[PDB]
Amino acid sequence: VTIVVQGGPGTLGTALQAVRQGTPIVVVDGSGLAADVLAYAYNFMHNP
Amino acid sequence: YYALSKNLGPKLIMMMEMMKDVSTFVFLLLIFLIGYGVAAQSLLSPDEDFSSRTFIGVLFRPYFQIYGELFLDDLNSEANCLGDTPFTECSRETVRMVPFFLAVYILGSNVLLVNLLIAMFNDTYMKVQEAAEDLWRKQNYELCA
Amino acid sequence: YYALSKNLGPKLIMMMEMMKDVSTFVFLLLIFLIGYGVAAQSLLSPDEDFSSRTFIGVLFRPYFQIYGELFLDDLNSEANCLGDTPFTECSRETVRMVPFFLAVYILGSNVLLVNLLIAMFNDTYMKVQEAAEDLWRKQNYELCA
Amino acid sequence: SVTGGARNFTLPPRLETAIAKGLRLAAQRTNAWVVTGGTNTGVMKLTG
Amino acid sequence: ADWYGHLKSVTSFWAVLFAFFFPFFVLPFINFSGAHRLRRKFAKFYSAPYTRFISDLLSHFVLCVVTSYFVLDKLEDTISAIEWILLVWFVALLLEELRQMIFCDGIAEYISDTWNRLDLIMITLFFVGFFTHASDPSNQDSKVVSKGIHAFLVVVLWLRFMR
Amino acid sequence: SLQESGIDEFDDCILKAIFSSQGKLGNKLKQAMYFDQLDVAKRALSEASKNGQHNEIAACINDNLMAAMMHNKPHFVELYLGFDAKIYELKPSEEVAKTNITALDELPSFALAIEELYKREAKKPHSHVQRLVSLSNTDVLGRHYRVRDLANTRAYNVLRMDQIFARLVSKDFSVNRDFTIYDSKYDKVPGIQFRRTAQASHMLFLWAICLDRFRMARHFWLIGDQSIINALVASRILERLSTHRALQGPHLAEERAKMQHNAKKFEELAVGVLGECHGSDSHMASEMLHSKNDMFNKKNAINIAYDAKSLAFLSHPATQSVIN
Amino acid sequence: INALVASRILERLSTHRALQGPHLAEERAKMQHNAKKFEELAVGVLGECHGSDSHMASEMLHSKNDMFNKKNAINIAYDAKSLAFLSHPATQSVIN
Amino acid sequence: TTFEALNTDKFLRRWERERQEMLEARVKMTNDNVVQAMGMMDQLLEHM
Amino acid sequence: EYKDRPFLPAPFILLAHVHMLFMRLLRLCGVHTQEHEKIQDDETKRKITTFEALNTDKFLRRWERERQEMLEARVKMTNDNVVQAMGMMDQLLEHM
Ligand SMILES: Nc1ncnc2c1ncn2[C@@H]1O[C@H](COP(=O)(O)OP(=O)(O)OC[C@H]2O[C@@H](O)[C@H](O)[C@@H]2O)[C@@H](O)[C@H]1O
Ligand SMILES: CC(C)CCC[C@@H](C)[C@H]1CC[C@H]2[C@@H]3CC=C4C[C@@H](O)CC[C@]4(C)[C@H]3CC[C@]12C
Ligand SMILES: CC(C)CCC[C@@H](C)[C@H]1CC[C@H]2[C@@H]3CC=C4C[C@@H](O)CC[C@]4(C)[C@H]3CC[C@]12C
Ligand SMILES: CC(C)CCC[C@@H](C)[C@H]1CC[C@H]2[C@@H]3CC=C4C[C@@H](O)CC[C@]4(C)[C@H]3CC[C@]12C
Ligand SMILES: CC(C)CCC[C@@H](C)[C@H]1CC[C@H]2[C@@H]3CC=C4C[C@@H](O)CC[C@]4(C)[C@H]3CC[C@]12C
Ligand SMILES: CC(C)CCC[C@@H](C)[C@H]1CC[C@H]2[C@@H]3CC=C4C[C@@H](O)CC[C@]4(C)[C@H]3CC[C@]12C
Ligand SMILES: CC(C)CCC[C@@H](C)[C@H]1CC[C@H]2[C@@H]3CC=C4C[C@@H](O)CC[C@]4(C)[C@H]3CC[C@]12C
Ligand SMILES: [Mg+2]
């Protein structure tokens, strides 16, 4: 289980190689920089 | 004629249901009485023939020694022990246990069975006094009938 | 043979668990007894040699003065104080504290430790009487066994 | 695995104690092997 | 754990009383929680506060029995050796009460207990009774007044024995 | 969401990311047992039983019982039973060494897991288990007055604690075990999958009468048979655990009062099964109370309750109907 | 009248001669509990008769019964030995 | 033994029914069913 | 009381006082042999204060869970959640 707390470009690279190697991720929304990007992308794509 | 008043009317029914615990205390008391009476009348009077006077001697002093009247001057005159101290220089040495059995008896009776009767009379007065006015109204109807 | 009836059967188990509080009252009572006995036998008889009669004098009258039998005529004859008032014109002035210690003793024992034993016997009869019928049914099984 | 921004970490203390209390109870109850970045700046310093 | 000390938890009253009265039978009792083994055994046995409590009980019971035999018997024309033993005894209790006076948290913390007031009362009335008897030993009335003070002494000795 | 959710939803979202990964079902149920979410793991096993998978569940749940007995979760061991739990196939964490004993070599590999649970129970400081074995003064096979490395590393075996409970009831228990039942050759007989859990559940019931755990002893009392006799044995073992000789200080007293409270709950359970036996067929209940027991030296259950000293079982009207 | 007959029949069922053992005692205590419920019901109907027209309730308690040998309901309650029916204020108004 | 096992199951069903007839478990299941009713009501609003 | 006593009984406690006066004359005076004292470490007392703070937070979380397990707070949150359910239900009607 990988937890993304705020982050930058290399944090999105570790999230990219976490998802592309099948490791599930936890993104905490409302925290900051890249976690709002990942939460906005998942809430745009899959949230009904 | 005490059933007209609201106080004395439940106190009669309380006195009858206390007299049942008195008969319970009779069945608890007669064992210690007759046992200390046969033992004390044997230790005071050895080599004496059986009569009705021995039966008065097993009924008289045990019963009245639980109410506070200790007969130690009369037991000292009865055991024929002479001295300023009441039991040192007796003729026989078996009468010096006549206080000692008496000690065990009043520890059987004066402080033990009597305070058991205060405990049963407290539970008896609670079992009457939670339901007193219904017994008074029943006796008011029995006065009318 | 009292275990067949539903009344006397818990009263035996109540009498044994009251006899444990009797032994507790023995351990509380022996301090005041032996202390007033050594003090009163020293104040009544000065310049007297120790024997078994002194040990009868420290065990006999303290024990029987807590049950109501006060020996004040025998203490007045023992202290050799002469008068219509029992303690005014004595030979020695230290025997006039022989009632006074006695006053403190019965305030130690006759009104204090005995009423502590009524309080422990009330709690003992409550701890028996909330669970009496299970003890009676257990003794009915022990009669059958 | 914990990932995050190293030198751009700037959070309020209430949210930092909330993430720290959740990660402390998760690391206490989990007995897990925590893989972070190795450097002493930011969220790896906080996880250490 | 401060009360038992190095004695674990499984000890009776009669076990520590029999090991107090027989120091050579203490050793078979295993050590709970060559020369240094047995010595550290009676060092950790006699360093416990429970052994000090049973030593002060039994020693105050030996006092109350010995002063009961002192007060109930007749006094002599001279000072007897049992009165000398009670004088040296109560000096040792007077040095123990001054030892508890200096090694305390205060004067009021010492005197706020009932037992320290009572033990001073019995030390004060024993020195008043012994100076009453030893002011004039060859008089009967001084023995009468001294046995009258010693009656109050043996009453408050039995009343201290409740501690 | 950090500020829009609660503080106790973060363990739910880590456990939801744990259940998002597939293929690690024993470690997924282990982190479900660590995060104490019972209904989420019940929904996971219900979705796995609905989808038709059973072989990953039957691999996972034996180590999940072992970890749930080791970490004291009673609702999880209530939950994993009913899903073909198979209590007798438990395996320990480590391997027991050879001790050159013919009785200890016949133990069928779950008794070492019971001894591993006893060794994990005795590893806590100020435990009553280690002081009770140290005040037992017995051998490794449980023989009285026979007091080694074997007797120290294998000091908490199940036969020694069986002899401690056999002395803890009375002087006439004489507990029997049959470890030659647990074999692959005795498979053609029908009812033995009853018997191979039930005595085995009784062994874990004795571990759950040692550690003052009421819910797990109630659940293994539910699984095993002879419920009245084992409830009165449970009340006698907790009533002799409530004094013994090590629980005599002032620092254990509410703990030993807790022992009295558990003892009272099992004797209420014994009355309640006999209350159901007073509900219907009381002549059959009178034949049950007159029936002899093979777990004692041929005495019936009223003599077992008198040796237990149980007042509520003697005051029942069916027992008083047999006595009257 | 049927509630006081119910309390008297359950109060004589609570002893009789067959319910004397230790094995029936909670059962006979159950008999006492039912008996108490019907005597509460008798008080409650008379409580409704103390709610309105108490002179008509006094004529009801003075009325003779054909189910007995011409005795009124206070004598029926005394033969029932019912303490709660005798302690009601309408019955005590008739007695007073 | 089968009569004892059937009476054990009848006692545990009757004790489960009597344990759910207490006031504490009734107030507890009333509280949790009102919380689940607010969750299903929040699903009804979001659907409206 | 009995932590600070010298052990030897009353008759012989004067010999222990002479021994205590000899240790008072030798030690904490001139010609002292040895004096013994002990001081706790800072990391051990820091472990005590962090253990005390973690047990304070575990007690206040357990006392908050036990205070919400009482019947009064359960009836109170049941009442306020039913009032909030009627407010969300009034939003559902107005939406219908
Ligand atoms: N691990 C690091 N330590 C120190 N400095 C770093 C690191 N990674 C990047 N930097 C530099 O510090 C600056 C701050 O960038 P941040 O956004 O704070 O960190 P980020 O770029 O997200 O680095 C992510 C890195 O951290 C780990 O969690 C993860 O493994 C990833 O490699 C960046 O411009 C970068 O050049
Ligand atoms: C359990 C308790 C109440 C015992 C009951 C006391 C009865 C049995 C005893 C106690 C005292 C006894 C009396 C004592 C003295 C006398 C005088 C004698 O000339 C005839 C017998 C007579 C009259 C006794 C009769 C029986 C008696 C009343
Ligand atoms: C265990 C207990 C109950 C034993 C019972 C004690 C009785 C039976 C025994 C023990 C001591 C005995 C006494 C010892 C000495 C004497 C002195 C002798 O000149 C007369 C008999 C007399 C007075 C004995 C009477 C009987 C006696 C009191
Ligand atoms: C368990 C209980 C009953 C113990 C019994 C105590 C017995 C053994 C003791 C207690 C008091 C004792 C008596 C006290 C004094 C004397 C006077 C002496 O000159 C002869 C023996 C005699 C008469 C004793 C006999 C034995 C005696 C009765
Ligand atoms: C705490 C209370 C119960 C004290 C116990 C009382 C005992 C120890 C005392 C009280 C009265 C005493 C008795 C009083 C009188 C005598 C007669 C004498 O010739 C021998 C001793 C003897 C027989 C005593 C024996 C001991 C005795 C029974
Ligand atoms: C705290 C309590 C114990 C106070 C003690 C009271 C003492 C000091 C008092 C109370 C009663 C007093 C006694 C009363 C009367 C007399 C008679 C007189 O001719 C000589 C003194 C003498 C014998 C007194 C001595 C002192 C005395 C014993
Ligand atoms: C504070 C209290 C307890 C002090 C104790 C009081 C005792 C120890 C003292 C106080 C007063 C004293 C008494 C005062 C006067 C007399 C008269 C004398 O001819 C004989 C002694 C006698 C009778 C004394 C005996 C001892 C005595 C009673
Ligand atoms: Mg002191």
Residue numbers in the entry:
A (entry chain D): 291 to 338
B (entry chain C), C (entry chain D): 917 to 1061
D (entry chain D): 146 to 193
E (entry chain A): 724 to 756, 787 to 916
F (entry chain D): 387 to 533, 547 to 723
G (entry chain C): 628 to 723
H (entry chain D): 1110 to 1157
I (entry chain A): 1062 to 1157
Task: Paste lines from the article.
We investigated a TRPM2 chanzyme from choanoflagellates that integrates two seemingly incompatible functions into a single peptide: a channel module activated by ADP-ribose with high open probability and an enzyme module (NUDT9-H domain) consuming ADP-ribose at a remarkably slow rate. Using time-resolved cryogenic-electron microscopy, we captured a complete series of structural snapshots of gating and catalytic cycles, revealing the coupling mechanism between channel gating and enzymatic activity. The slow kinetics of the NUDT9-H enzyme module confers a self-regulatory mechanism: ADPR binding triggers NUDT9-H tetramerization, promoting channel opening, while subsequent hydrolysis reduces local ADPR, inducing channel closure. The structures of srTRPM2 exhibit a characteristic TRPM architecture, from top to bottom, a transmembrane domain (TMD) layer containing the ion-conducting pore, a signal transduction layer consisting of MHR3/4 domain and the C-terminal rib helix, and an ADPR-sensing layer consisting of the N-terminal MHR1/2 domain and the C-terminal NUDT9-H domain.
A cation binding site is found between the MHR3/4 domain and the Rib helix of each subunit, termed MgMHR. This site does not distinguish between Ca2+ or Mg2+ either and is unique to srTRPM2 as the key residue, E1114, is not conserved. Replacing E1114 with alanine eliminated cation binding at MgMHR, resulting in a reduced rotational movement of the intracellular domain around the symmetry axis when ligands were bound, as compared to the wild-type (WT) protein. The E1114A mutation had no obvious effect on macroscopic currents. However, single-channel analysis showed a small decrease in channel open probability and a small increase in channel close rate, revealing a regulatory role of this cation binding site on channel gating.
